Amino acid sequence: TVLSALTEKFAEVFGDTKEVEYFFSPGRINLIGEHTDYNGGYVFPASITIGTTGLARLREDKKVKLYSENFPKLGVIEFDLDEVEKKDGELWSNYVKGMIVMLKGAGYEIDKGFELLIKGEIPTASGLSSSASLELLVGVVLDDLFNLNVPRLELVQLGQKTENDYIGVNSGILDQFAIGFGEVKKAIELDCNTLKYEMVPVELRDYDIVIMNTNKPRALTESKYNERFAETREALKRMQTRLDIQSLGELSNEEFDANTDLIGDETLIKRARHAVYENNRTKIAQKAFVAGNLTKFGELLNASHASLKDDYEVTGLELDTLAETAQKQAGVLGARMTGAGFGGCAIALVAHDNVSAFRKAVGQVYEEVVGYPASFYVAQIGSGSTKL
């Protein structure tokens, strides 16, 4: 269907539809381990079904044409294979340029032009990783048309590199890895420090993963994020004077706790603390998950939420409203914000049968409180990016 839609939307915009190829790159959620990725910690994310889809083909020439069903008002975008280096304001093609730029930089050669049509179910500021989906979409597309044999990991590090180096957004490999390594009904246990990971099948029993979007209108600016990154780095530096660690992730909670003096600043102390605690927490939480102790698991979820609420300070009235109200509900294991923070989505582990009611009970409070409405969706675990 959708394709048919896309498909027919391609000849229009682009004329024909010959030798065209279909791709898809999902979005993701992090079950646990937030703001650890860039602090040498573990993460427990999963790819969802909502993602980004692309129809594209090779060109005759070295020109690049792009259409985005989500922003039709730009009409078509083009550039030739030689402006990849110069961004264009905050346009979407930027992600396409960067990837090309990164791709080439790794020795890969994108010698021709091509066409690209995309549609993405991932909400602009959902916190569900729209950038990474796209980067990865491009990744696999380029990887396919130009028949490169880009290893997933590189592909992934390249997408992170674009975000970071080109787009200019600070981050860890969190989104790229999940999206890149996604597997149907599987979550990824990843050690960010070593890039060693484990695929974990999602085994929730009668529980569903309910995604709650604050729908909070906010400035897609990203400084608070950038400060965090800043902050912990500093803390880490201070720690490094007397400590032989490459990241905050190396520290036991006790070890951290004993050395807070190295830091001194109260706020710095909180951030890094959140960085330490969170990492260890993930470790244990994932085992719980693995052990089928959904309960302990859910309690840990709640715990991640408060650390983020209190020590790292990235939640907010909205995020807190959702999670906490959600926790209050019956047939709810625990709940927390997922992703960056500062709005976006939260998730909950809720009894399949209590879901419909949960949405209502929880939304109500929210609207009341936040004044506005939240959005509910049940997560659906799918595969990472691919040529399908």
Ligand SMILES: OC[C@H]1O[C@H](O)[C@H](O)[C@@H](O)[C@H]1O
């Ligand atoms: O866990 C917090 C999370 O926030 C954003 O989504 C970043 O892009 C991820 O790399 C990660 O740092």
